[PDB]
Write an enzyme that holds these catalytic residues in place. Structure first.
Site, PDB file in Angstrom:
ATOM      1  N   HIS A 243       0.791  -1.212   0.000  1.00  0.00           N
ATOM      2  CA  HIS A 243       0.000   0.000   0.000  1.00  0.00           C
ATOM      3  C   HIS A 243       0.836   1.281   0.000  1.00  0.00           C
ATOM      4  O   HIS A 243       1.980   1.325   0.455  1.00  0.00           O
ATOM      5  CB  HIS A 243      -0.862   0.092   1.313  1.00  0.00           C
ATOM      6  CG  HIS A 243      -1.504  -1.211   1.688  1.00  0.00           C
ATOM      7  ND1 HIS A 243      -1.147  -1.942   2.768  1.00  0.00           N
ATOM      8  CD2 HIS A 243      -2.407  -1.971   0.996  1.00  0.00           C
ATOM      9  CE1 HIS A 243      -1.838  -3.052   2.841  1.00  0.00           C
ATOM     10  NE2 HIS A 243      -2.562  -3.125   1.731  1.00  0.00           N
TER      11      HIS A 243
ATOM     12  N   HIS B 108       1.166   4.574   1.946  1.00  0.00           N
ATOM     13  CA  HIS B 108       0.760   5.193   3.205  1.00  0.00           C
ATOM     14  C   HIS B 108       0.885   6.694   3.081  1.00  0.00           C
ATOM     15  O   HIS B 108       1.620   7.227   2.204  1.00  0.00           O
ATOM     16  CB  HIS B 108       1.615   4.654   4.364  1.00  0.00           C
ATOM     17  CG  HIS B 108       1.184   3.249   4.753  1.00  0.00           C
ATOM     18  ND1 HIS B 108       0.756   2.981   6.026  1.00  0.00           N
ATOM     19  CD2 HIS B 108       1.122   2.087   4.049  1.00  0.00           C
ATOM     20  CE1 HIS B 108       0.469   1.667   6.132  1.00  0.00           C
ATOM     21  NE2 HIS B 108       0.703   1.125   4.943  1.00  0.00           N
TER      22      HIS B 108
ATOM     23  N   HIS C 165      -3.078   4.254   5.670  1.00  0.00           N
ATOM     24  CA  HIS C 165      -3.143   4.250   4.198  1.00  0.00           C
ATOM     25  C   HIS C 165      -3.543   5.595   3.691  1.00  0.00           C
ATOM     26  O   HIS C 165      -4.390   6.296   4.273  1.00  0.00           O
ATOM     27  CB  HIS C 165      -4.064   3.125   3.684  1.00  0.00           C
ATOM     28  CG  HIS C 165      -3.608   1.751   4.077  1.00  0.00           C
ATOM     29  ND1 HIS C 165      -4.488   0.695   4.217  1.00  0.00           N
ATOM     30  CD2 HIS C 165      -2.377   1.245   4.304  1.00  0.00           C
ATOM     31  CE1 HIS C 165      -3.816  -0.388   4.561  1.00  0.00           C
ATOM     32  NE2 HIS C 165      -2.533  -0.077   4.651  1.00  0.00           N
TER      33      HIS C 165
ATOM     34  N   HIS D  93     -11.143   0.520   3.785  1.00  0.00           N
ATOM     35  CA  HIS D  93     -10.150  -0.262   3.056  1.00  0.00           C
ATOM     36  C   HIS D  93     -10.774  -1.286   2.120  1.00  0.00           C
ATOM     37  O   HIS D  93     -11.818  -1.859   2.464  1.00  0.00           O
ATOM     38  CB  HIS D  93      -9.269  -0.966   4.084  1.00  0.00           C
ATOM     39  CG  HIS D  93      -8.209  -1.839   3.481  1.00  0.00           C
ATOM     40  ND1 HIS D  93      -7.026  -1.315   2.981  1.00  0.00           N
ATOM     41  CD2 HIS D  93      -8.138  -3.172   3.343  1.00  0.00           C
ATOM     42  CE1 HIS D  93      -6.292  -2.306   2.501  1.00  0.00           C
ATOM     43  NE2 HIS D  93      -6.926  -3.457   2.703  1.00  0.00           N
TER      44      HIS D  93
ATOM     45  N   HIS E 173      -9.181   2.614  -0.189  1.00  0.00           N
ATOM     46  CA  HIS E 173      -8.328   3.787  -0.004  1.00  0.00           C
ATOM     47  C   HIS E 173      -7.618   4.013  -1.356  1.00  0.00           C
ATOM     48  O   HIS E 173      -7.355   3.037  -2.054  1.00  0.00           O
ATOM     49  CB  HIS E 173      -7.310   3.495   1.076  1.00  0.00           C
ATOM     50  CG  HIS E 173      -7.909   3.202   2.402  1.00  0.00           C
ATOM     51  ND1 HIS E 173      -7.396   2.233   3.238  1.00  0.00           N
ATOM     52  CD2 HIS E 173      -8.940   3.737   3.101  1.00  0.00           C
ATOM     53  CE1 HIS E 173      -8.082   2.170   4.382  1.00  0.00           C
ATOM     54  NE2 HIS E 173      -9.004   3.107   4.307  1.00  0.00           N
TER      55      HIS E 173
ATOM     56  N   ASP F 214      -4.652   1.681  -1.682  1.00  0.00           N
ATOM     57  CA  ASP F 214      -4.870   0.244  -1.640  1.00  0.00           C
ATOM     58  C   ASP F 214      -4.476  -0.457  -2.928  1.00  0.00           C
ATOM     59  O   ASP F 214      -5.299  -0.537  -3.862  1.00  0.00           O
ATOM     60  CB  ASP F 214      -6.349  -0.120  -1.309  1.00  0.00           C
ATOM     61  CG  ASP F 214      -6.659   0.315   0.121  1.00  0.00           C
ATOM     62  OD1 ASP F 214      -5.685   0.636   0.850  1.00  0.00           O
ATOM     63  OD2 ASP F 214      -7.839   0.352   0.546  1.00  0.00           O
TER      64      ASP F 214
ATOM     65  N   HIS G 239       3.922  -5.316   3.466  1.00  0.00           N
ATOM     66  CA  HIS G 239       3.588  -5.886   4.748  1.00  0.00           C
ATOM     67  C   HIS G 239       3.899  -7.400   4.920  1.00  0.00           C
ATOM     68  O   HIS G 239       4.082  -8.148   3.973  1.00  0.00           O
ATOM     69  CB  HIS G 239       2.056  -5.769   4.987  1.00  0.00           C
ATOM     70  CG  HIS G 239       1.559  -4.392   4.719  1.00  0.00           C
ATOM     71  ND1 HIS G 239       1.547  -3.505   5.789  1.00  0.00           N
ATOM     72  CD2 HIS G 239       1.085  -3.711   3.648  1.00  0.00           C
ATOM     73  CE1 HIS G 239       1.091  -2.330   5.412  1.00  0.00           C
ATOM     74  NE2 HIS G 239       0.805  -2.437   4.139  1.00  0.00           N
TER      75      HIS G 239
ATOM     76  N   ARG H 238       4.947  -3.882   9.065  1.00  0.00           N
ATOM     77  CA  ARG H 238       5.540  -3.251   7.877  1.00  0.00           C
ATOM     78  C   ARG H 238       6.950  -3.757   7.704  1.00  0.00           C
ATOM     79  O   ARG H 238       7.770  -3.386   8.543  1.00  0.00           O
ATOM     80  CB  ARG H 238       5.492  -1.714   8.113  1.00  0.00           C
ATOM     81  CG  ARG H 238       4.061  -1.321   8.489  1.00  0.00           C
ATOM     82  CD  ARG H 238       3.949   0.191   8.715  1.00  0.00           C
ATOM     83  NE  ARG H 238       2.573   0.555   9.078  1.00  0.00           N
ATOM     84  CZ  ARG H 238       2.048   1.757   9.211  1.00  0.00           C
ATOM     85  NH1 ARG H 238       2.795   2.862   8.997  1.00  0.00           N
ATOM     86  NH2 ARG H 238       0.754   1.902   9.533  1.00  0.00           N
TER      87      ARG H 238
HETATM   88 CU   LIG Z   1      -0.570  -0.774   4.423  1.00  0.00          CU
HETATM   89 CU   LIG Z   2      -6.260   0.600   2.833  1.00  0.00          CU
END
Ligand SMILES: [Cu+2]
Ligand SMILES: [Cu+2]
Ligand SMILES: [Cu+2]
Ligand SMILES: [Zn+2]
Lengths: 151, 151
Positions: free
Chosen positions: A44, A46, A61, A69, A78, A81, A118, A141
């Site tokens: 993602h 951020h 995010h 999400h 998001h 995403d 992640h 992360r």
């Molecule tokens: Cu993330």
């Molecule tokens: Cu998200």
């Protein structure tokens, strides 16, 4: 900008280089990430390009439209995403994504923000619990980097 | 947007955190850099936020108006020319600069670009050789980071 790049680093062995290129009204995201456990890993954009506390200071995010999400093909997601990348048995994930919501200019620009890979798979908001609709249950992360302007 | 941050890292002991904040119609740069040799060190915004080859891939100084290198108070300077930072006997340099040419949005935006601290003093384009007109003879890049959006 028309092109951007991000080098992913962390405290473990995960690392990678991600490239971004504007094409039409989409961004094409390509690159590779190594040192991962085989399987899917959430991926993602951020919100903040702040690496003062490793990947933790990148924040949540990127979500300028204040949605829940989801996966990249969902209407409710998001902006950050991008779903999952998949590593093979040797820990190598090849990145090949085309996305129409992220941008390299204007309001949804991701330049100056952070890419994060992640620990676990992103459940795409279909996990059944509340964390699913915030982070996809992707967990820790492993690595991150600020997205910079490229030549 | 209104606030940015950059974490400087390299292969040596030099590290630092630089904050940027749009105040009124200008940009205020603050922070500190440690691990430096006593004396002046060139401190510039380089064009690309590309760290795939360490600080080398950051390219030359950000220079949208195609000018020769100079000091921060000169008419003829690159937009990324922020002069020198000065380290004390303990290797610490306190950053406290107000600059009129850099921005955090628009054509002069340095978001997504790279902040670099150099090995030697920047001669401010007054050294008399061709190199002075490009880099100030500031030499190698000791540490650098991509400038990201902060909260
Ligand atoms: Cu993330
Ligand atoms: Cu998200
Ligand atoms: Cu420089
Ligand atoms: Zn210069």
């Amino acid at each position: 900008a028309t092109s951007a790049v991000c080098v992913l680093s962390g405290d473990g062995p995960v690392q990678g280089t991600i490239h971004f290129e504007a094409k039409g009204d989409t961004v094409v995201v390509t690159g590779s990430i190594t040192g991962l456990t085989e399987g899917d890993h959430g991926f993602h954009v951020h919100q903040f390009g702040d690496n003062t506390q490793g990947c933790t200071s990148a924040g949540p995010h990127f979500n300028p439209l204040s949605k829940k999400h989801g996966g990249p093909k969902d209407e409710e997601r998001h902006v950050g995403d991008l779903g999952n990348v998949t590593a093979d048995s040797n820990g190598v994930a090849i990145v090949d994504i085309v996305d129409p919501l992220i941008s390299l200019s204007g309001e949804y620009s991701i330049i100056g923000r952070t890419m994060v890979v992640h620990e676990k798979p992103d459940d795409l908001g279909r996990g059944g619990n509340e964390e699913s609709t915030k982070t996809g249950n992707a967990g820790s992360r492993l690595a991150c980097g600020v997205i910079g302007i490229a030549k």
